[PDB]
Design a protein around this ligand. Structure first.
Ligand SMILES: COc1cccc(OC)c1-n1c(NS(=O)(=O)[C@@H](C)[C@@H](O)c2ncc(C)cn2)nnc1-c1cccc(C)n1
Ligand SMILES: COc1cccc(OC)c1-n1c(NS(=O)(=O)[C@@H](C)[C@@H](O)c2ncc(C)cn2)nnc1-c1cccc(C)n1
Lengths: 578, 314, 292
């Protein structure tokens, strides 16, 4: 595979780490394996020490009061990677053997068996106005050269790889996080019996949260307002233990309950950061750098063995509160990611161009032959490409994603490979179901350069509509209804295909983070807005130009760990003419 | 019951020396804060500015008092300026102590409760805090507006500017209202401010000691340095402020316990010295706070590479 | 009851100057040094001078309310007189400097680039203020209070006892007063009127050809020039006028019906010249884009 590498400011120290994010199983944590390639000539007699540091920052701009450093070490570990004497007694894991085969005499394996009880690598909100490093837990692996652990630490010969400590959801589903309350007031007929229920204990990030509410106003006292707020608790046990609150997803409904009346209704609230950037103290998931990241993942403490771990133990819960002419109850759900099959790309996948030099445009082969369809990119993409199979006038379907992984439900007749910037699709046997042209897309950058088109000669879904042709310079709006994908966890990639040419990206919308990217050649005229109430994407159109005639496609993609453009519409033809 | 012989010629001297030094300091710190307000953008910047204004207005009205004490305790100026000067003196006193304690609370937030300091909107928080500080100072000082007045010729044509009470207090209630207002002055001056400061700096000192109790030996040296600055700050506050309070209480008790006239005479004689010593607070406040602040001093005057990536062979 | 009406006018100008000069000082302070140029520094100095001019007033408002009686302490009358004279002279001088710089920048720099740098404008302002202070020194020196009657009506008449000769009191005071009034109005007014005449000749010779906006630009320029001259004429000219008449009456033996009238006008025209400092911020803000 591809393994992350970072060199020292000098260069002799080079740390090879397979993955930046390590799964935190409750009982035990995966070893922080890796290797530290070192130059024997540079270290005449020195040693290289690899240190895992679970820092916790609590005040911005350490020494903010002229001397008082404002960071602590929740947990630290060290390992003398060189010389590795028999006292190490550390078996070589698959990653380490792979690397040390990859490298030579500089093979130095370091292992950290970090203790089970630690907080997640959740960094608090840096604050819009507030300046400085975020006050939250953060893990770092540093291979620094020294002879004594207390010796001077040289920033010119110290590497640093920030690591992430995230807890993916448990495969087994938990119990329904219901909750009931009943309180009384002046009247003496019947307390207010409020019941709240949630669809499940585990809600994948950005997926809708179903808040079923049922109340019974038997007394004359009446409710004027209902309020459902998914609140994020940051239980900071540091120094002075105290739980904090920061509402995440709010919905204030004017729905009322008359006296002697029973009321029920299933709301639906979805956490999303875009309308929450300004709330300070909010908990955000692992960050390698200042790039955008989702709301924090609910912490998974050891079952009933919690000792109030020192740090930010993020919890979540939905408070449903009805105000009488204030009955509250909570449901403690767990908002955390699925277990992605591939390493979660922490940097924004299509981050803030590349030309997709695809070849050969045409090639003919019989059934069952062995052919290759190569490509090239002007700039590196690092296994962040995908492939799609356009049958004539048929929505292209995703086949390869990440340049290696075959998309589920696709025959393995197709295989992906990478070699530098050359991303190749190799067929094992050209079945008759191949009358299509293959395109390759790069999504590492906002200009989503689709393939130029490689036509090989064999010799749920999104409904897109609302298109109007023969508009010379008028406006329009194409509507794409998504049957089974919510725009908060899904990004909509409107693309267009000109006659006999590869598609060119039109407009991308990502509801969760908020920012919307517009195609370079069509910037101020093509607008994208995804209305959540119906999960309907709208591509508004203005000042048409002759070349904008094309067949337009509305797309789907997992907002988190962007795989590709998998679920696609049929295609709506729009022509620019009289 | 007569003032010290050398007082009539030395008290104006110390007053005017305080005027010169305190203006040279407070005006300088105010100008520096205005210059570097955008650069600093610290919630303590507004508190420093409030203290600077308090100190400057405190030393500004003193020279009139100095020239009055020069004239065997007689006010030369107009009664309106008697009132304005007394009000400025007292408000600046209270607000100097209050700004010191507000900086104490801010340092408590940013030293012992760092998470709360981070999440709290320190800009608007400091703005609201300084507004409340100033308004409370003015409201507390309000009585002096009408209590200070010119009169009491005593067949000497000496228009003394004094803390008049007969307007509010009855002949039998002169002592009652006088002690009530003096008690309010003392308590709201330091009893609450001083105990708040005491707890704040106790927690702050314990926290700095605990924080620097590890890491390295030089860490202990810097911890000793920070404990030293805390100790000198609180000790300077004590030395400058306490005497004025103690003589307030002693002059009041001179009616109940009936302290000896000799001791009462000493109290009177040392009272102008106690006013000067209290003024020492504003005199040193530039030095005590703005000198410590690196931003004021500045205003008055390797790479870690980037994560790569490489492929392996199966 | 003029002695009671005019103090009300003093209070009115006090409030009006408070608001106006406070606002203009605020806005000029808000402007960054990058935006601020020599003109900005000059107008800020004028604004501060006018603010002091109006802030040292309420003492005088009370003074005239008590029928020229001064209970505000002996020294503060001298300090208030110093601040009034310095603010007035500095205001007129700063306005003259503003006009001079505008004339020397609009068309002179392309014709003759012989001027002090805008950075040196601060030094020029400091020199202007120093000149105002040293010219205002004599009024302070001569300012000492006293009832002057059998009643307790202490007031700060400028005393000339330092001359030590009664016969020369009149000569000394006329000499100082004529020098001061000349430097206060004739010199500044003459210089800025020469500047206005220069620029007027320029526009007369330049806009002979008609343009689409020539009419509107010419009308707004006429409004600007007429208001600029009038704001100083109607305010400061009457003051120094009556002052000169008072000085020259004794030699001219002006009958009493004028000299007493000369006294009568002065408290009024004193406010008429005060309000100019008040209205300076408003006019400057309106025509600031026009001037540029
Ligand atoms: C020397 O002091 C003054 C001189 C002039 C004006 C004063 O006041 C406006 C103050 N003064 C006062 N007077 S006093 O306190 O009434 C005083 C007249 C008399 O009662 C008294 N004799 C002896 C004792 C022990 C107590 N009390 N109390 N505090 C201040 C004060 C505080 C801080 C700063 C300054 C300049 N002055
Ligand atoms: C009404 O005018 C005053 C009122 C109160 C105090 C004054 O003092 C400065 C002025 N005054 C004065 N007279 S005077 O200074 O009292 C006086 C000693 C002498 O100068 C004088 N000779 C002739 C006449 C007719 C009057 N007085 N001359 N100019 C100002 C002046 C200038 C600018 C602004 C103001 C308010 N006032």
């Amino acid at each position: 595979t591809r393994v992350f590498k970072k060199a020292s400011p000098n260069g002799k120290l080079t740390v090879y780490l397979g993955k930046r994010d390590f799964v935190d199983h409750i009982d035990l944590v995966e070893p922080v394996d890796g290797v530290v390639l070192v130059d024997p000539e540079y270290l005449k007699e020195r040693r290289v020490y690899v240190t895992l540091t679970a820092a916790f920052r609590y005040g911005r701009e350490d020494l903010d009061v002229l001397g008082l450093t404002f960071r602590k070490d929740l947990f630290v570990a060290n390992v003398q990677s060189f010389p590795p004497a028999p006292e190490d007694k550390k078996p070589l894991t698959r990653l380490q053997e792979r690397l040390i085969k990859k490298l030579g005499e500089h093979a130095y394996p370091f292992t950290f068996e970090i203790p089970p009880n630690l907080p997640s690598s959740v960094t608090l909100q840096p604050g819009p106005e507030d300046t400085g490093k975020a006050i939250g837990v953060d893990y770092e692996v540093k291979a620094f050269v020294a002879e004594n652990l207390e010796e001077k630490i040289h920033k010119r010969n110290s590497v640093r790889l920030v690591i992430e400590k995230v807890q993916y959801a448990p495969e087994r589903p938990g119990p329904q996080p219901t909750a009931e309350t009943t309180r009384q007031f002046l009247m003496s007929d019947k307390p207010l019996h409020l019941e709240a229920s949630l669809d499940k204990e585990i809600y994948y990030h950005g997926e809708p949260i179903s808040v079923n509410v049922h109340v019974t106003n038997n007394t004359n006292k009446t409710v004027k307002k209902i309020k459902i707020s998914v609140r994020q608790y940051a239980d900071i046990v540091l120094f002075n233990t105290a739980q904090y609150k920061v509402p995440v997803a709010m919905e204030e409904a004017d729905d009322t309950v008359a006296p002697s009346s029973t009321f029920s209704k299933v709301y639906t609230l979805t956490p999303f950061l875009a309308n929450n950037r300004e709330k300070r103290g909010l908990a955000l998931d692992g960050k390698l750098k200042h790039e955008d990241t989702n709301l924090a993942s609910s912490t998974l403490l050891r079952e009933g063995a919690n000792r109030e771990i020192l740090g930010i133990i993020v919890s979540y819960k939905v408070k449903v509160k009805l105000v009488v002419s204030d009955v509250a109850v909570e449901l403690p759900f767990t908002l955390m990611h699925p277990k992605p099959k591939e390493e979660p790309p922490h940097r924004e996948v299509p981050e803030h161009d590349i030309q997709m030099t695809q070849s050969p445009s045409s090639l003919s082969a019989s059934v069952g032959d062995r052919v290759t369809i190569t490509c090239r990119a002007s700039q590196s993409v690092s296994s962040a490409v995908a492939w799609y199979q356009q049958k004539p006038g048929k929505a292209p379907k995703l086949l390869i994603y990440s340049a290696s992984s075959l998309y589920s439900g696709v025959p393995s007749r197709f295989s992906g490979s990478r070699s530098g910037t050359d991303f190749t699709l190799t067929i094992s046997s050209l079945q008759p179901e191949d009358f299509a042209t293959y395109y390759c897309q790069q999504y590492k950058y906002v200009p989503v350069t689709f393939g130029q088109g490689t036509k090989v000669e064999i010799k749920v879904q999104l409904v897109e509509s609302g298109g109007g042709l023969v508009q010379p310079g008028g406006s329009l709006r194409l509507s794409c209804a998504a049957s089974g994908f919510n725009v908060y966890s899904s990004s909509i990639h409107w693309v267009r295909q000109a006659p006999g040419k590869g598609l060119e990206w039109v407009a991308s919308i990502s509801s969760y983070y908020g920012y919307t990217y517009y195609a370079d050649s069509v910037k101020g005229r093509f607008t994208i807005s995804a209305d959540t109430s119906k999960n309907t994407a709208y591509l508004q159109m203005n000042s048409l130009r002759a070349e904008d005639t094309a067949v337009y496609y509305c797309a789907r993609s997992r907002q988190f760990w962007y795989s590709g453009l998998d679920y696609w519409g049929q295609g709506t033809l729009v022509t620019v003419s009289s | 019951y007569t003032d010290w012989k050398s007082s009539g010629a030395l008290i104006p001297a110390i007053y005017m020396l305080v005027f010169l030094l305190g203006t040279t300091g407070n005006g300088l710190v105010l100008w520096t804060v205005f210059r570097s307000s955008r650069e600093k953008r610290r919630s303590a910047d507004i508190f420093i500015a409030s203290l600077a204004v308090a100190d400057l207005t405190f030393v500004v009205t003193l020279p009139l008092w100095a020239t009055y004490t020069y004239r065997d305790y007689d006010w030369p100026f107009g009664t309106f300026f008697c009132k304005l000067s007394s009000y400025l003196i007292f408000v600046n006193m209270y607000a100097s102590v209050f700004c010191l304690t507000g900086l104490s609370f801010d340092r408590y937030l940013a030293i012992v409760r760092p998470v709360a300091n981070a999440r709290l909107r320190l800009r608007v928080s400091g703005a609201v805090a300084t507004a409340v500080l100033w308004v409370l100072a003015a409201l507390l000082a309000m009585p002096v507006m009408v209590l200070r007045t010119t009169g009491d010729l005593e067949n000497t044509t000496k228009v003394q500017c004094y803390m008049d009470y007969s307007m509010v207090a009855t002949v039998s209630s002169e002592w009652a209202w006088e002690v009530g207002l003096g008690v309010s002055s003392t308590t709201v001056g330091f009893v609450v401010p001083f105990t708040i400061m005491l707890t704040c700096y106790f927690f702050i000192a314990q926290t700095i000691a605990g924080h620097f109790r590890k890491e390295r030996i030089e860490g202990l040296r810097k911890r000793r340095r920070l404990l030293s600055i805390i100790v000198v700050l609180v000790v300077t506050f004590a030395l400058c402020w306490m005497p004025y309070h103690l003589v307030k209480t002693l002059y009041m008790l001179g009616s109940l316990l009936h302290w000896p006239c000799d001791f009462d005479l000493f109290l009177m004689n040392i009272f102008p010295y106690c006013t000067c010593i209290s003024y020492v607070n504003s005199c040193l406040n530039p030095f005590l706070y703005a000198f410590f602040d690196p931003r004021f001093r500045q205003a008055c005057t390797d790479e870690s590479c980037t994560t790569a990536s490489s492929s392996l062979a199966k």
